[PDB]
Amino acid sequence: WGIHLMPPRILVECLLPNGMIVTLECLREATLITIKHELFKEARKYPLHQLLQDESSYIFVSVTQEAEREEFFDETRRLCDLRLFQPFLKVIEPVGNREEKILNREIGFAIGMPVCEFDMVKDPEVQDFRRNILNVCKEAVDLRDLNSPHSRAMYVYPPNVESSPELPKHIYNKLDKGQIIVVIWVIVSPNNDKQKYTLKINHDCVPEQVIAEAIRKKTRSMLLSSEQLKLCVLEYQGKYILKVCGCDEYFLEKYPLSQYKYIRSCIMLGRMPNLMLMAKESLYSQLPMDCFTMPSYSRRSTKSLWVINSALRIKILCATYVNVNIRDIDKIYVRTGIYHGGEPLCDNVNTQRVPCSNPRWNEWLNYDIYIPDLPRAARLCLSICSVKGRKEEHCPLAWGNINLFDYTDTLVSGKMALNLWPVPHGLEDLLNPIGVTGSNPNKETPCLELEFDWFSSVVKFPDMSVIEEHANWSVSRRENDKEQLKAISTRDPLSEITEQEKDFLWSHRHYCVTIPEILPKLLLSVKWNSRDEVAQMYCLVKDWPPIKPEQAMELLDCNYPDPMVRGFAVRCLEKYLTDDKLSQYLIQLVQVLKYEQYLDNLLVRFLLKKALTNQRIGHFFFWHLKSEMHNKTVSQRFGLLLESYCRACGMYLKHLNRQVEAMEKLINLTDILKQEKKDETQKVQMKFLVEQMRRPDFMDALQGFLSPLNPAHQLGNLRLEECRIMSSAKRPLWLNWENPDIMSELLFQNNEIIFKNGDDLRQDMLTLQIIRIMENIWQNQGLDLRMLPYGCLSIGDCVGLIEVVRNSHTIMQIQCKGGLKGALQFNSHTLHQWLKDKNKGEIYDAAIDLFTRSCAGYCVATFILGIGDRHNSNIMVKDDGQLFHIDFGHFLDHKKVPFVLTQDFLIVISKGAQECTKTREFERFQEMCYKAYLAIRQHANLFINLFSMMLGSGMPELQSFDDIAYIRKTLALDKTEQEALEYFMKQMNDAR
Amino acid sequence: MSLQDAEWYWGDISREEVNEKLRDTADGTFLVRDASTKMHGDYTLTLRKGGNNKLIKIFHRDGKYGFSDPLTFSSVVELINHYRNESLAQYNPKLDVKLLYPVSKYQIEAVGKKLHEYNTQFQEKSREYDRLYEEYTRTSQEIQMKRTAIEAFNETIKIFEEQCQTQERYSKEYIEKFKREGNEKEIQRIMHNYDKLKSRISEIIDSRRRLEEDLKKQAAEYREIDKRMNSIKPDLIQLRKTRDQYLMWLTQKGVRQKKLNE
């Protein structure tokens, strides 16, 4: 193919069901109904026309650029939209249900691969997954249709609410004696001019009570009987709902008004809630019916592991496409290890060293482990390694991991071929036990051949019924202590547990139940390489008291592979994890899916159900999976999971396709500049840019679609004049849409997004997630350090969107608005003068307060997380006075950090003084930092959990648990609070 | 005889750094640190056993040391020497291993000059490898997309070859009828169209061949880039290990220099 756009008219060769072929000239925009009709009109000029049936009997098939033999059932599609590999169409008679095939094509477009590639998969586990997971789809679709239309409105437009109604007193103190003033709008004319109705209401009113006050204030002069008034209230309560002016957020559930995030922000930011009164039948009118059709693929002697009286043994045969310089490195060998998560269950064993030119070992490897002692989550981790010396030095060539038990509980037997994976960039370790289990699908990859023992029959892991028996069989064979348990409970997830502490915890495993959050430390104390201790641990886990979600999430990382542990953790989430905090931790919950041994597990069924019943999290569930589909190590799991989602998410697939299509023409457009058209400068890039965006097929695709950063934001028409390509980083696009909302003027009329391509963005998602987290806990603890976690979404391989904040500048841009003072030196007071000029009068002290508070927060966050490379062009400040950082490419000081704070900030903090650090304003600023820093330390567990769940992500900043040690130093977790303050205080003074 | 002189005591190095000093090492390799608490008197013994790094707390209570409440050692040195000659099963029968292998702790303008050279060498060989890795992935992208394009050719060619076999089928009985009717014109129309079909199909197999050849030659460059990356990875760790000990050696007498060297 290799054609960016098809010419105006092209000649497509049409293959008829007789022998004939017809070259048919047809317009690029021509539809298949047009093509077919004109074809069968042209076909009369060719021989054997008698054999042709009426065109109604046939459809077109052709090959796509994805190599798919696609049946073009949907004949309303356009020739240029077919993704044809070559311009030809084969006339054939349709076979198979039309709706499945038209749906499969739009699913394949959304997930990015032809669904038929799943049909052609040998693995039984793949076919079992896409068959068995359909029950999670049906019960999610049945659930959302129970109480239609309201239940369907709750699915597509779920309440955006905080986790609890109780306002933090810091926020409640802004209310007018516990009341809030709101303005309610009505569109009262065909020309659509609006009427106001301002109310003052108790902050905890539910939306229906707000409707009752609106009608009370409107009827105050109607002299209505108390009974007749209630008839008006009952009517409007049952006939209208409230909407946020400017975006698609609706108050459909009877939560207190103050815990709707839009309005708790208006209380925080002292703004005026603007709500539109809307007929709920007009809302339901924009929710077309959808149905979950069950797909076509939903149709159509052993012995125990504990009776194999032998030690483990695995054979390494040979390897194929190994890429080594025969004359540079001496020999190669296969390294192996038996692992349970990250813990090796026994010492590692290598094959002999063999010449490069003959990767032949034919070795049985013996492991120091009695087969019955194998834990269910046990797995084999291997790699081909090279050696050279003159010290001896090793380094790996490729790796691969294998589950010793498959998804059916059976123990692997017989020969097995395993195509290995490239070693990840910047990994020297010989094995990669945190990588995925699986074989590399790519061709000409080094294939390592193995063999497992065959014990005369298929071996199965024992049933839990037998395990609890052995537990009862094995078990038959105070004040200072409970302070020990409480003390060990306090320590963070990555604390050092000594051998004395381990078997102390295990010795008191029955008294640990009184302190349920001790479970992670206790599970790490188990001898997982012993059938006995594991059997007893299953019995404890079976009746273990549930723990808070943010501690259960720990048990889903790579240190806790056992399916009983993970099952307990998932049951904690699906009972305690609110949809709010689920949506907030979704990035980590999607990542730890990678650690899962098998496709069908309790976590993925949890995430899928909640994703098919809450379209707010289902949206980001899709993009977090879609953004990673390029990676072949996880392409299959996420692909099948995306299939099950797009097959049941309902009418929202139509909107996801518009987003995917729009993002596609943005990456294709940006690729042409950043990779091909590199010779040309900015001004010639601009005139080039607009000509692309003048095209109708581009405008039609980049206008009228939902924002991936927040689907409640509609992106209408483009303001081409405001669009531009920025002069920074890898030349990102600045895009601007009109907000088509009926009342856009009350929120924002310009929606501006930055589209960047070339550098990894999921460092930013994590740090921006973290920043939002530590902002939320400061507010709840009485610190009003306003942070700015602007929106950011990775949509593909080093490509994504960034929410730009209005009325903001870099401090570099502000220094350029002032003058010079020292020789070739900007005036350090320029920043303060700029805040004075934009906050004249009584709003001056406020801006300096907002600057000092927001500054304090970002100083603590950057120091803790190790964000380096902080300079004047990635530090920004609003006209408001709020300060925030951008471009979080690094963290954990990934350089092969100081406490940043420049004179320009000090002269704002000190309101322009000369003895900056000796002012009372600066000593107040230090107090903010010391309090903020300490507050993070007392929540350090959930921050370390958030990082440890992302270890398999592929972000080079954190490849191993040792990389998370940077945050244990900045927070000084192995010391006392009083040693931490001194450490933090010194890190601040050491910068002065 | 004093702890400060013992080869296997390393002071306040980090847990993360004994992990790097014990990786892929044999059972019985051991160090002793100051506890991560960095509080006076406390130490932690770390020994390898079963491919893992076991942490043993060394308790201190009134000038004597030990792992358990019977602290029966006047010094940390004699505590370590006892278990250097007796199995730790004497303390915990699970740990049937003795301290077999202590990790020893040694193995001005001119060193600043040599640190600068090895660092320059390391940095530019780090750029050497970072360049091949982007060429390795850039070549990987182009290969798997050329592979799908070849499977696209396969599908079109399969669809066209069945078009030939349906032409040769449904045309046979009509050609045979035309020839005995003496209608050469109607036969030439069928051959004119058959030959055009047979010409386009051969144009497509030629485009497949030209890509098969373009791919097979690029998939070999791909393997060769892997060859010479695997040749740089070991030399790159070597260059790193020398600069690290040079920078530490120079940290003992020239902090002012490294502050300006690089």
UniProtKB/Swiss-Prot annotation, chain A:
Record's keyword annotation contains DNA damage: no
Pfam families registered for this protein in UniProt: PI3_PI4_kinase, PI3K_C2, PI3K_p85B, PI3K_rbd, PI3Ka
Effect noted on mutating T970N: Found in a glioblastoma multiforme sample; uncertain significance
PI3K/PI4K catalytic domain sequence ranges: 719-992
Sequence ranges assigned to domain PI3K-RBD in this UniProt record: 177-279
GO cellular component: cytoplasm; cytosol; intercalated disc; lamellipodium; perinuclear region of cytoplasm; phosphatidylinositol 3-kinase complex; phosphatidylinositol 3-kinase complex, class IA; phosphatidylinositol 3-kinase complex, class IB
Protein name as it appears in the record: Phosphatidylinositol 4,5-bisphosphate 3-kinase catalytic subunit alpha isoform
Higher taxonomy: Eukaryota, Metazoa, Chordata, Craniata, Vertebrata
Swiss-Prot record, chain B:
Transmembrane segments: none
Residue list for modification Phosphotyrosine: Y133, Y246
Chain's role: Binds to activated (phosphorylated) protein-Tyr kinases, through its SH2 domain, and acts as an adapter, mediating the association of the p110 catalytic unit to the plasma membrane. Necessary for the insulin-stimulated increase in glucose uptake and glycogen synthesis in insulin-sensitive tissues. Plays an important role in signaling in response to FGFR1, FGFR2, FGFR3, FGFR4, KITLG/SCF, KIT, PDGFRA and PDGFRB. Likewise, plays a role in ITGB2 signaling.
Part of the whole protein covered: 326 to 596 of 724
Annotated phenotype, changing R84Q: In a patient with severe insulin resistance; lower insulin-stimulated lipid kinase activity compared with wild-type
Family indicated by similarity: Belongs to the PI3K p85 subunit family.
Tissue specificity field: Isoform 2 is expressed in skeletal muscle and brain, and at lower levels in kidney and cardiac muscle. Isoform 2 and isoform 4 are present in skeletal muscle (at protein level).
Protein modification: Polyubiquitinated in T-cells by CBLB; which does not promote proteasomal degradation but impairs association with CD28 and CD3Z upon T-cell activation. In adipose tissue, polyubiquitinated by the BCR(KBTBD2) E3 ubiquitin ligase complex; recognized by KBTBD2 through the SH2 domains, undergoes 'Lys-48'-linked polyubiquitination leading to its degradation.
Positions of the SH2 domain: 8-103
Protein name: Phosphatidylinositol 3-kinase regulatory subunit alpha
Highest taxon, organism lineage: Eukaryota
Disease per record: Agammaglobulinemia 7, autosomal recessive: A primary immunodeficiency characterized by profoundly low or absent serum antibodies and low or absent circulating B-cells due to an early block of B-cell development. Affected individuals develop severe infections in the first years of life. SHORT syndrome: A rare, multisystem disease characterized by short stature, anomalies of the anterior chamber of the eye, characteristic facial features such as triangular facies, lack of facial fat, and hypoplastic nasal alae with overhanging columella, partial lipodystrophy, hernias, hyperextensibility, and delayed dentition. The clinical phenotype can include insulin resistance, nephrocalcinosis, and hearing deficits. Developmental milestones and cognition are normal.
Comment on protein domains: The SH3 domain mediates the binding to CBLB, and to HIV-1 Nef.
